[PDB]
Structures are given as C-alpha cells and as structure tokens.
Design an enzyme around this catalytic site. Structure first.
Site, PDB file in Angstrom:
ATOM      1  N   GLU A 126      40.249  38.808  24.404  1.00 14.03           N
ATOM      2  CA  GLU A 126      41.332  37.682  24.945  1.00 14.03           C
ATOM      3  C   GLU A 126      42.262  36.433  24.554  1.00 14.03           C
ATOM      4  O   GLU A 126      42.259  36.162  23.219  1.00 14.03           O
ATOM      5  CB  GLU A 126      40.411  36.551  25.771  1.00 14.03           C
ATOM      6  CG  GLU A 126      39.160  37.107  26.380  1.00 14.03           C
ATOM      7  CD  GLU A 126      38.004  36.154  27.110  1.00 14.03           C
ATOM      8  OE1 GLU A 126      37.924  35.034  26.907  1.00 14.03           O
ATOM      9  OE2 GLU A 126      37.600  36.651  27.324  1.00 14.03           O
ATOM     10  N   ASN A 168      40.130  43.561  24.714  1.00 12.09           N
ATOM     11  CA  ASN A 168      39.285  42.995  26.199  1.00 12.09           C
ATOM     12  C   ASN A 168      40.197  41.997  26.618  1.00 12.09           C
ATOM     13  O   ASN A 168      40.137  41.023  25.650  1.00 12.09           O
ATOM     14  CB  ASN A 168      37.984  43.489  25.751  1.00 12.09           C
ATOM     15  CG  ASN A 168      37.099  43.158  26.814  1.00 12.09           C
ATOM     16  OD1 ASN A 168      37.262  44.280  27.421  1.00 12.09           O
ATOM     17  ND2 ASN A 168      36.312  42.173  26.888  1.00 12.09           N
ATOM     18  N   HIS A 204      35.985  39.935  35.866  1.00 10.81           N
ATOM     19  CA  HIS A 204      35.626  39.043  36.547  1.00 10.81           C
ATOM     20  C   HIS A 204      35.891  38.267  37.937  1.00 10.81           C
ATOM     21  O   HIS A 204      36.776  37.894  37.985  1.00 10.81           O
ATOM     22  CB  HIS A 204      34.801  37.607  35.763  1.00 10.81           C
ATOM     23  CG  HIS A 204      34.765  38.012  33.839  1.00 10.81           C
ATOM     24  ND1 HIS A 204      33.636  38.415  33.776  1.00 10.81           N
ATOM     25  CD2 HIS A 204      34.925  38.467  33.134  1.00 10.81           C
ATOM     26  CE1 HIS A 204      32.313  38.413  32.960  1.00 10.81           C
ATOM     27  NE2 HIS A 204      33.560  38.710  32.273  1.00 10.81           N
ATOM     28  N   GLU A 231      33.005  43.529  31.699  1.00 12.19           N
ATOM     29  CA  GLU A 231      32.479  42.776  32.314  1.00 12.19           C
ATOM     30  C   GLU A 231      32.143  42.371  33.261  1.00 12.19           C
ATOM     31  O   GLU A 231      32.368  41.501  34.026  1.00 12.19           O
ATOM     32  CB  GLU A 231      33.034  41.106  31.045  1.00 12.19           C
ATOM     33  CG  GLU A 231      32.914  42.060  30.118  1.00 12.19           C
ATOM     34  CD  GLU A 231      33.482  40.436  28.719  1.00 12.19           C
ATOM     35  OE1 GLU A 231      33.176  38.758  29.381  1.00 12.19           O
ATOM     36  OE2 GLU A 231      33.950  40.575  28.075  1.00 12.19           O
ATOM     37  N   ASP A 233      31.590  41.621  37.369  1.00  3.11           N
ATOM     38  CA  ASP A 233      30.567  40.936  38.073  1.00  3.11           C
ATOM     39  C   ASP A 233      31.909  40.662  39.606  1.00  3.11           C
ATOM     40  O   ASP A 233      32.957  39.833  39.238  1.00  3.11           O
ATOM     41  CB  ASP A 233      30.177  39.946  37.730  1.00  3.11           C
ATOM     42  CG  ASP A 233      30.881  39.103  36.496  1.00  3.11           C
ATOM     43  OD1 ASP A 233      32.185  38.764  36.508  1.00  3.11           O
ATOM     44  OD2 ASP A 233      30.516  38.618  35.527  1.00  3.11           O
TER      45      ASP A 233
END
Length: 299
Positions: A126, A168, A204, A231, A233
């Site tokens: 990030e 990432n 996300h 990651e 979800d």
C-alpha cells in the site's frame, strides 16, 4: 474436490490467510489442511512482528506459520517487507537516510531468513494514496525519496532471488486513478529493469465486483508481470456468491493470473467483523460462496 485441487488443475493456487492464534482450533486447522495450497501470515510477518527493536529480529511466530505451510506441502506468501502501517515503534520515529538504511536492512534480513521458503513476497505494501489522483501516499518511507519502492525491490531480489517480488495494494481492483498510479510505476519498473515480478490486488470488496475487474487485471499482465488476488473478501449479501464466482472467472480469463488468496478461513475469523465476507461460516461450514468458487474453478 477442494479449492486447491481444482485451482491447481487450472495452473493456479488457492490460498488462505491464517493467524498463529487459531492454530490450536481443530476445525479451523482442518479446513486449512485441505482447501488451500498457499498460506499467508495475517500478522506474524509484518515489520513490527519481525523486528521489534532496531537491527534485532524475532521470526518465532512467523516461522510457526511458514513451517506449518511447508510441512503440509503448501506454498507460502510473504506479507510484507515494507509498509507504512504497523511499523515497530522505533521505526515510526526515524526519518531520512537512517530510516532508508533501517528499511533496507529490514527487507534484506527478513528476506534472507526466509530465503528458499517463500513463493512470493509482498515487498512493498500500500504505497499509493486514496485521493483520486493516483499520487504516492505520504509516509516517512516515501519522504526518504520517491525511489524507496525501487530500493526495496532491489534489496529483496538480492536477499532471495527465487522469490516472486510483488507490489500489493487495495482500491485497485477496477480501472481508477489509483490502479493507474500503480500501473504507471510498474510500467516504469519494467521499462527500467527494476526487479518486480507480480502485482497484488487485495480486493477487499464491498458487495459487488467492478465491471472492469478483469480488464484491469489484464492490463497489468500485459506488462509482463504476474497478477495475484492477495487478500480477497466480499461483503455479505445476495450477490456475495455471484461476486466470488466473478473474481475467480476474471482470474481464469487472464493467463498471467496465478492464484487467489481469501483473507481468512471462517466468517468469524475476519478482521472485517460483521461483514461475513468469507467462504466458511463460524460453525465451519461451506457457504454458498464456496460452491460458486468451486464451480467456477471447474466449469
């Protein structure tokens, strides 16, 4: 089948993020033994976890995750060598050259310790703002020099040349100002031979997958990097299972998309409490979203 079996048969991995804390939970450890062929540590390999004090390293909890992964035949992702967030306190208060020195020391030593055990490294995590201009996030790291992302990849390639080196980030799933700021950096890195092998997409999600999720994945793979959904979800709802099935089909459609990691086993294990954004519920059962993922891997 399982997720991991039927994602391999497509040339891909299906990974899960785990936390040492739960590794005594029988039903939790079972789902992980079977469904996933890739493992991240949810917290045990971040900067504060691995270098509590300057130039002094504890890999104790990270190793418990890595060695469990290798022992059961699973790939391992490394999360993460460089990140503004969750810096050990001594690092938050440094700046300038000495911060730059401390940062590279962290990357080469962590990557050295895990050399040969790490399928891919989130080298830098990030680094871009959420400000609609695709600019760099202002961090003590970024204030050492705009080239700190480059220096960090260079130090990691040195320390472990077998590992895939990822960038990432989140809010990068569609075609927006942020993915295009990432895109331009990576393009320049590939232009100049900076050692970067993959770009990670945290994904996300809210409740819905962007229309151009795959178009954005694909523009990056065309740079000659691999792409990874790191990651994943998705906020619960009636479209949840549709949203997982779409993320999987966007990765099967893109030839350089090597695999998908969802960010936890069970809904109850999620950092996103209340969202129920995972493939299993607290009682350990397969959700609808699990069947959507398994079909999409098979269709």
């Amino acid at each position: 089948t399982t997720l991991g079996q039927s994602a391999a048969e497509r040339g891909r991995y299906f990974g899960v993020a785990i936390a040492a804390g739960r590794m005594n939970d029988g039903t939790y450890m079972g789902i992980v033994d079977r469904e996933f062929d890739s493992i991240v540590a949810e917290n045990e390999m971040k900067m504060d976890a691995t270098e509590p004090n300057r130039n002094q390293f504890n890999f104790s909890n990270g190793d418990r995750i890595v060695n469990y992964a290798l022992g059961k035949g699973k790939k391992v992702r490394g999360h993460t060598l460089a990140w503004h967030a969750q810096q050990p306190g001594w690092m938050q208060n440094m700046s300038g050259q000495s911060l730059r020195d401390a940062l590279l020391n962290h990357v080469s030593r962590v990557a050295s310790y895990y050399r040969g055990k790490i399928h891919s490294w989130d080298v830098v995590n990030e680094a871009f703002a959420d400000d609609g201009r695709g600019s760099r996030r202002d961090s003590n790291l970024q204030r050492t020099g705009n080239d700190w992302i480059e220096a960090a990849f260079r130090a990691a390639r040195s320390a472990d040349p077998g590992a895939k080196l990822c960038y990432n980030d989140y809010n990068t799933d569609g075609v927006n100002a942020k993915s295009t700021g990432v895109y331009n950096m990576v393009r320049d890195f590939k232009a100049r031979g900076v050692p970067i092998d993959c770009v990670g997409f945290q994904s996300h999600l809210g409740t819905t997958v962007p229309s151009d999720y795959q178009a954005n994945l694909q523009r990056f793979a065309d740079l000659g990097v691999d792409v990874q959904i790191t990651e994943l979800d998705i906020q619960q709802g009636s479209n949840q299972a549709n949203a997982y099935r779409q993320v999987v089909q966007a990765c099967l459609a893109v030839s350089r998309c090597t695999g998908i990691t969802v960010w936890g086993v069970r809904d109850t294990d999620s950092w996103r409490t209340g969202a129920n954004p995972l493939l299993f519920d607290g009682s350990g059962n397969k959700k609808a979203a699990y069947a959507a993922v398994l079909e999409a891997l098979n269709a």
